[PDB]
C-alpha cells in the first residue's frame, strides 16, 4: 500500500453541478479508478485526496465541466520485502494458485523458488517432503522479488470477432512469491 500522485482530466456532467465540486470530482475519479489497474503502475483501490483543481473548461459542444485535477490514490505496491497472508483457492501442478479474499487473485508462484523438496503429483497428493505439508485454502506466507507488467495487447477486430464467435495473460499486475527461508508458507508451523 503506497500512494501515487496522478494528474487526469475529469468531466463533470451538468447534472452534478448541484453537488459540491470536490465531491463530484472524487465521484468521477472513483468511477475511473475503482478497481482498475493503472498500466505498469499497479492496482488502485480508491483516491486519497485532491491537490490542485484547475478551473473547469467547456468545449463548444458539450456543456459539461472538464477539470484538470491532481490527486493521490492508494496503490498496492510490494517491491521486494513484503510478506503477505494470502488465501489459496486453486491447486495445479505448475505452482499453486495463491489468492486473496477478492482484492486481486491472478498472481502465481513458481515451485523452483519455493522450497526445493515440494513436488506435485498426478494422483493429487499434496506434497512430498524429506516432514510436514499443507492443503488448499489455508494461510500462506511468501515474499516478492520482481514485477512483470503485461501491457502488450495487439488485438485485431476480426480476430476478436472470431474469438467472440468461438466463445491469455488476464492481468496487467501480478505477484511472485518465494519460500527460501524457514517459516513462510504458514503462520503456524510451530508453537
Partner 1 sequence: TEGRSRDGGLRLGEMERDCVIAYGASQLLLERLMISSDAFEVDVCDKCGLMGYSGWCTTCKSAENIIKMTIPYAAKLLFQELLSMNIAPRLRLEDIFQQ
Partner 2 sequence: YKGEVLGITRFGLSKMRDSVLQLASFEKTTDHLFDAAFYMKKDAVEGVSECIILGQTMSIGTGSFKVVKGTNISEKDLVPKRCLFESLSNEAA
Partner 3 sequence: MKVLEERNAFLSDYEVLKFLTDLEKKHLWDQKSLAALKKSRSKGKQNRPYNHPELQGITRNVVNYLSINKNFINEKSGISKMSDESFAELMTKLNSFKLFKAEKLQIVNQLPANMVHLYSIVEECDARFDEKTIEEMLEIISGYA
Site residues (CB under 8 A) for partner 2, limited to 2-21: 21
Instruction: Based on the shown chain and the rule CB under 8 A, indicate whether residue 48 belongs to the binding site for partner 1.
Output: no
Instruction: Based on the shown chain and the rule CB under 8 A, indicate whether residue 55 belongs to the binding site for partner 2.
Output: yes
Task: Look at phi and psi of residue 128 and say left if phi exceeds 0, alpha if psi is from -120 to 50, else beta.
Answer: beta
Which residue's CB is nearer to partner 2, number 20 or number 182?
20
Residue where the block lists cell 465541466: 65
Among 17, 48, 66, 149, binds partner 1 (CB under 8 A): 66
Contact 116, 128 (CB under 8 A): no
The distance of closest approach from Cβ of residue 110 to partner 3 in the complex, given in angstroms and rounded to an integer, is 19
Distance of CA 27 to the CA centre of its chain: 21
Task: Look at phi and psi of residue 158 and say left if phi exceeds 0, alpha if psi is from -120 to 50, else beta.
Answer: alpha
Contact 149, 38 (CB under 8 A): no
2 contact, one of partner 2, partner 1, partner 3, none, CB 5-8 Å limit per kind? partner 3
Site residues (CB under 8 A) for partner 2, limited to 63-82: 65, 67, 72
Binding site for partner 2 (CB under 8 A): 21-22, 48-58, 60, 65, 67, 72
Amino acid at each position: 500500500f503506497i500512494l501515487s500522485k496522478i494528474a487526469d482530466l475529469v468531466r463533470i456532467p451538468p447534472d452534478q453541478f448541484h453537488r459540491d465540486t470536490i465531491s463530484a470530482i472524487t465521484h468521477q475519479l472513483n468511477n475511473k479508478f475503482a478497481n482498475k489497474i493503472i498500466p505498469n503502475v499497479g492496482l488502485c483501490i480508491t483516491i486519497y485526496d485532491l491537490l490542485t483543481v484547475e478551473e473547469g473548461q467547456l468545449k463548444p459542444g458539450d456543456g459539461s465541466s472538464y477539470i484538470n485535477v491532481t490527486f493521490r490514490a492508494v496503490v498496492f505496491k510490494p517491491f521486494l520485502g513484503e510478506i503477505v497472508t494470502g488465501w489459496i483457492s486453486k491447486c495445479t501442478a505448475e505452482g499453486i494458485k495463491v489468492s486473496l479474499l477478492g482484492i486481486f487473485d491472478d498472481i502465481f508462484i513458481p515451485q523452483n523458488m519455493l522450497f526445493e523438496g515440494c513436488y506435485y503429483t498426478p494422483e493429487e497428493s499434496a506434497w512430498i517432503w524429506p516432514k510436514l505439508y499443507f492443503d488448499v485454502n489455508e494461510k500462506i506466507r511468501f515474499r516478492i522479488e520482481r514485477e512483470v507488467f503485461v501491457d502488450v495487447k495487439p488485438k485485431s477486430p476480426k480476430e476478436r470477432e472470431l474469438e467472440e464467435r468461438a466463445q491469455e495473460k488476464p492481468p496487467a499486475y501480478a505477484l511472485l512469491g518465494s519460500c527460501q527461508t524457514d517459516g513462510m508458507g504458514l503462520v503456524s508451523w510451530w508453537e
